[PDB]
Amino acid sequence: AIKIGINGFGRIGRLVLRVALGRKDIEVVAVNDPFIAPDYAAYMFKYDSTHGRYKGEVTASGDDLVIDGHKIKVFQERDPANIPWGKSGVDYVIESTGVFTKLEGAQKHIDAGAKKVIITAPSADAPMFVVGVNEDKYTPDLKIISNASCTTNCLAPLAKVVNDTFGIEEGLMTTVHSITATQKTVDGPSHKDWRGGRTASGNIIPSSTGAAKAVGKVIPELNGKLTGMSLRVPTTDVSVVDLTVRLKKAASYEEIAQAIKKASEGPLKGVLGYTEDAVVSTDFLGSSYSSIFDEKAGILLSPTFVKLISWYDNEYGYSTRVVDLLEHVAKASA
Amino acid sequence: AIKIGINGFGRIGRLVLRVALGRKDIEVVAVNDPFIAPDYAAYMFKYDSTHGRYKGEVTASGDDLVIDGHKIKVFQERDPANIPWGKSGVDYVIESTGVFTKLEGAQKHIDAGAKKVIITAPSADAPMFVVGVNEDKYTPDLKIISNASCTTNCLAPLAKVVNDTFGIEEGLMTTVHSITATQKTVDGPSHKDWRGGRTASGNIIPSSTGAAKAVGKVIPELNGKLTGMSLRVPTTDVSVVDLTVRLKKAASYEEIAQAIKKASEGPLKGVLGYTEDAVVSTDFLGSSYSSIFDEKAGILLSPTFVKLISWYDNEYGYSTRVVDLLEHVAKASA
Amino acid sequence: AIKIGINGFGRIGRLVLRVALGRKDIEVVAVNDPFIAPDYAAYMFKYDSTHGRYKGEVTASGDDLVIDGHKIKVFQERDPANIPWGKSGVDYVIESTGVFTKLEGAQKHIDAGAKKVIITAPSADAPMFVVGVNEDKYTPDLKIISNASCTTNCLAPLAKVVNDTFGIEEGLMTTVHSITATQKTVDGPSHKDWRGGRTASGNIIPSSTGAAKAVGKVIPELNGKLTGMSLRVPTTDVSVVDLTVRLKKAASYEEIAQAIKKASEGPLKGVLGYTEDAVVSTDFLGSSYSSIFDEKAGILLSPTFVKLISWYDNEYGYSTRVVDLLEHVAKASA
Amino acid sequence: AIKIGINGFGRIGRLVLRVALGRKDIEVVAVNDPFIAPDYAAYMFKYDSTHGRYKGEVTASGDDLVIDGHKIKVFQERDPANIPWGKSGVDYVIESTGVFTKLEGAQKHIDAGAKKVIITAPSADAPMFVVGVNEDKYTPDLKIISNASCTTNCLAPLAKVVNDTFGIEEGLMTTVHSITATQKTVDGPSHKDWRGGRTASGNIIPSSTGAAKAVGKVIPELNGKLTGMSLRVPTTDVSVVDLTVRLKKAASYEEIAQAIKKASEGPLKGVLGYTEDAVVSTDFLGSSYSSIFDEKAGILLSPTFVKLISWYDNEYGYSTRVVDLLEHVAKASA
Ligand SMILES: NC(=O)c1ccc[n+]([C@@H]2O[C@H](COP(=O)([O-])OP(=O)(O)OC[C@H]3O[C@@H](n4cnc5c(N)ncnc54)[C@H](O)[C@@H]3O)[C@@H](O)[C@H]2O)c1
Ligand SMILES: NC(=O)c1ccc[n+]([C@@H]2O[C@H](COP(=O)([O-])OP(=O)(O)OC[C@H]3O[C@@H](n4cnc5c(N)ncnc54)[C@H](O)[C@@H]3O)[C@@H](O)[C@H]2O)c1
Ligand SMILES: NC(=O)c1ccc[n+]([C@@H]2O[C@H](COP(=O)([O-])OP(=O)(O)OC[C@H]3O[C@@H](n4cnc5c(N)ncnc54)[C@H](O)[C@@H]3O)[C@@H](O)[C@H]2O)c1
Ligand SMILES: NC(=O)c1ccc[n+]([C@@H]2O[C@H](COP(=O)([O-])OP(=O)(O)OC[C@H]3O[C@@H](n4cnc5c(N)ncnc54)[C@H](O)[C@@H]3O)[C@@H](O)[C@H]2O)c1
């Protein structure tokens, strides 16, 4: 029994719960969010503007969120050191607040009695993992780890296949990315990111991202070879990586597509998907892939210079990978 | 001769400044916003997703926002008691934070050296005014007043005409309303208003509003005769009042429309507008009216039961009224 | 078996197919759409921006659309008289083009060998039915019938309960309505509906509707007692009825809600739904109800004057009713 | 006087009229659109969801569109051969229907009595020009020409500066592009572009474009050195070029920015703009530039491998260029 708690009952926290409730080996013991009371947590979990109503019975009773008859404790602590993880029997904490992304903050959960923490974001200092790429490098002494970003989980599996087969010499990427909770409904204050304060649903908004650099951390051979940027656009979920790369070995576009298709059918099955259909972003709502290569959308300019397109449900694909990483950690430590 | 300061440099604060800079007798001395430094204030005023670039020169210099040569001091105080309104020579404070809407909160501005405060919102206890309806009832001894809500400013002039002519027995109102800064880009916490936390750009969102009942405060004879609710929809600005009203006297629709046209040409000129064109919400972006009657959109069922439709730029029409009420207070107080 | 064909493979045509595939008594023999070839029909049926991917295998094979092994003939006839319904063994035609909504056009399906036609829209000509309101008035001599509009299917069950219990004296309705295929992505020509040509996703757009007067056709006692209008807003599916009604018998809001709840649990089960939750439009994506009463959103101004709010998935609830009406017609004619 | 007519009174046709009415030497004699009657033409010209109301008097009288006293004949011919251009004294036709983009189609305007045609789109046939880049290659023996695409007009001035100063070895472009009139409000038939049939306001939609390869026609030294693709996103106007380019000569990003700033201040003034502000797409609504380099948004991977960002109001910048090309052609003609 993988006994877990969730800190930060937001987009990622609530969807990680949806995914986790479908895994036989996982018991979600408790969640913590100081802004969400038990009855409110039942409301937020049951109804979802992006991914539909939860197919199951959702209520609250006292301090319990009750889903299909399973009782989940709801705590409301601003300070993770005050969450009763150990007294509740929680061994793994999903750290999905966006607030405790460094080792020093995430360690508070272990102080509070958990054993291990998975940060659902890039971490400035916790080791980072992408399932399908380097989760095999996880060892049980690592108590606090990061599942990287949603963009890194799209880019890294694709870059892995391309680099393995043809070699990546250099690459620049853009993610055309759905809006998120950090943005504003109308022009408002965002002192740390002026563009990000502008009306989210009315603008294309250039943004920064460390996701391309981060690929060189989970694929050390690509260290320093990739960088990138983001354009936030008025869709509510699903994002797309636009990867422009110089290759070491010359290829045709068909050969590149065939290498990606082969990986998607074998070692990257369930992580890297493949399509030749006339897909659009809504076609990936609820997709569990980290990366779906759009074969028809990309374009080759030279035998060593190509643009590759790959989709990802930044909320739900990533949330699935959180749970996958959790189960790999529990299996590797058993 | 009117020396004002602006607290809360947001949608209303910044657009009130836009309007004020166009008024002879107004000198904007300072603004206060603890989240917006001077250089950031210049950026937020210059560029607007809804109302376009400020046609003028906007820069910052030290602690001054500089607009077409005029220097405006920028304070950053969370507590209005700490704002040097008096030392700066500010006589009037435009209270547009949404946080100090009661006499208790707005009085802090006077304790800080200002003389009078106009709250850009309904107030639980401050006297309320709607230009064109009851601003002549303002008396100079009133130091803290409210300019009501954008919705009240749309409904009250319309209701005043209908009541003055045919009489209003009772009326139920819906405002189909653009999203505002209190809403969320994706499903997030909103513990005082659960529907309002849901994805703003992807939902029709019911919301309570006292704006129809508040008409009874500015039109005492309509006390208890109007109420209603709101539906927030994914437009970024401009809203519409849908007033279903029972009349005391039998009328034809042509008769109602003529009465409204007469009012808009005479005593409510510039406040109540009138159109017979095939208008949609974007046609009122930047409109200075409080209320624009849409003659072709309404429908009569019986001679005493009719549905009336009136548009309003909830940001800019209201902001213009804020400045209009300020100039009336100053004049009445001379 | 109920052997059917679908004319017009659009939003309604394709969602009617989705519903019908879940009904054991129905065999979908064929579809016709001159603008959609077989492989394109497979794509349009498989991928849906609003209702997700079809959960099942969708391919095309020569002239057949193939869904979970069941083959469906695809015709491409502009003129319904040329569709080989009789030769194909089709007895019922779902007429969902929007082009053939009168008896004269719909009869061409019967000339072509079908037995009966259900028009998925109001008809100037053909008798109209709303399941849960008057489908037991269907008699087998009626060969061509209309399932009314999506708004009429939301308003009529609600009006039936309120009129049955308290009596409706008069009522005025607004539907705040999602955009549809007749609208335009940017300001474009719509010479019969000038407002309807303006940018659909950027505007609140007033529109005329006969849906409230049509209630008086399916509930004859309400003939002449209801009318209304529409406001199109930038959501892509789900709409809401805003009914302002004068009652004959006085009541509390709670008594009104209780009458609707009882109907929803009894004679209008599956047609009229009932909620007290903090719902928004996306919470009814895929709902099979015609009408979901929003208990917390309405408001009462006098014991005989109240505003009632009811939701509907204008695409999917209506499409479910089309199939329900079809099964009622087949059973009534056996 | 440059006497002109406009064929296709759409987004480009109407905005070309707005621009042309501000040029002293141009007389707009007539417009043609079989779907827009004279009074409807006045409505569509007067009200604009994207660019506001026309600041001027707009009426219709008989068969004339009347703008600030100037009468413009309104024709309604589906076949341009039937437009009485000659009898009306029109010398230059702006061909903005999207339907007559080849020499054979546009020639009908000359058979009907016009002298020269400017197609407001790429042509498979007609020589293409981009103002600021190659309009000095226009010669008056050319009777039918193309102003290329809005994306080519953004990319070409940028590529010219970069190629002139550092040399372009090769480049791959993505345009993140606002929706246009060819898209659909909900999933509908688009048999030649399946992705383009999907819900425009709810999807990121990949699309082909020859815009980058077309730069090689107006800058022949760049033939075969650029290509790219498009992602349509739910904004109603303004688009952005994302150019990933390999340089021949090593550069710092600062030298690149400085070269573009210099060109924007001299030989490309009014065509190529330059900004270092925290801009988003709405900040370029109504901009007359072909291309606005976003200095802060771009990123450098190596001294010869860089990503450059440039904005454009695809409707209004391009419409202004159509009028600029017209005046250049007329100066060289007659
Ligand atoms: N949304 C995405 O697409 C996405 C994808 C991958 C990763 N992430 C990352 O996951 C994290 C969460 O993202 P989100 O999109 O779910 O954000 P969110 O804002 O939806 O959720 C954050 C939650 O944290 C809660 N919270 C805030 N302070 C807290 C505290 N002190 N203790 C406990 N709970 C607290 C909030 O109430 C909220 O419910 C962020 O690091 C983000 O970068 C987001
Ligand atoms: N359409 C409208 O937006 C509209 C119309 C009429 C009235 N109003 C009302 O006007 C008020 C402001 O609304 P808004 O839409 O401009 O909101 P907003 O969020 O755009 O602006 C509020 C501003 O107040 C600032 N602020 C927050 N706390 C502060 C403090 N302690 N001291 C000083 N400044 C502070 C914020 O930083 C922000 O800039 C609200 O009461 C609102 O109900 C809004
Ligand atoms: N969308 C809704 O919410 C809704 C709800 C209730 C009723 N309706 C009604 O249903 C009908 C269709 O609506 P929709 O929204 O599905 O529209 P749609 O445009 O999505 O579908 C109409 C289909 O008819 C096809 N078609 C056109 N001409 C044809 C012909 N001559 N023969 C066969 N097929 C043809 C089109 O190619 C298209 O696929 C309309 O009458 C509409 O008013 C729509
Ligand atoms: N951003 C842009 O919208 C943009 C930018 C650059 C170029 N263009 C190009 O300009 C052209 C028009 O684009 P638009 O966006 O203005 O399209 P639009 O659909 O807004 O306008 C096209 C107009 O042509 C009219 N029309 C159709 N058939 C006709 C005929 N036979 N005779 C006369 N008029 C006819 C239509 O009624 C419509 O008003 C296209 O070639 C397009 O690719 C568009």
Coordinates of C-alpha atoms in Angstrom, one line a residue, chain C residues 93-95 100-103 106 116-131 134-135 138 142-150 152-153 214 217-218 318 321-322 325-326 329:
Chain C
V93 CA -34.9 10.0 -41.0
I94 CA -33.4 12.4 -38.5
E95 CA -33.5 15.7 -40.5
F100 CA -35.4 21.1 -44.8
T101 CA -37.5 22.2 -41.8
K102 CA -40.9 22.4 -43.5
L103 CA -43.3 19.7 -44.5
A106 CA -39.0 16.9 -45.3
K116 CA -41.3 9.1 -41.1
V117 CA -39.1 12.2 -40.5
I118 CA -38.1 14.0 -37.3
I119 CA -36.9 17.6 -38.0
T120 CA -34.3 18.6 -35.4
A121 CA -35.5 22.2 -35.3
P122 CA -38.7 24.3 -35.1
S123 CA -40.9 23.9 -38.2
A124 CA -43.2 26.5 -39.7
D125 CA -45.3 23.6 -40.8
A126 CA -44.8 20.3 -39.0
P127 CA -46.4 19.5 -35.6
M128 CA -43.9 20.0 -32.7
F129 CA -43.2 17.8 -29.7
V130 CA -41.2 18.2 -26.5
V131 CA -40.5 14.9 -24.7
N134 CA -46.5 16.6 -25.1
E135 CA -45.0 13.5 -26.8
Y138 CA -48.1 11.9 -30.9
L142 CA -48.1 12.2 -38.1
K143 CA -45.4 11.3 -40.7
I144 CA -43.3 14.5 -40.4
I145 CA -42.7 16.1 -37.0
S146 CA -40.4 18.6 -35.3
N147 CA -38.6 18.1 -32.0
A148 CA -38.7 21.9 -31.5
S149 CA -35.6 23.9 -30.5
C150 CA -33.1 23.4 -27.8
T152 CA -38.0 25.3 -26.1
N153 CA -36.9 21.9 -24.7
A214 CA -43.4 27.9 -29.2
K217 CA -47.8 25.4 -29.0
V218 CA -46.7 22.4 -26.9
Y318 CA -31.3 18.1 -27.4
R321 CA -34.3 14.1 -26.9
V322 CA -34.3 13.6 -30.6
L325 CA -38.7 11.1 -29.4
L326 CA -37.7 8.7 -32.1
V329 CA -42.6 7.4 -32.2

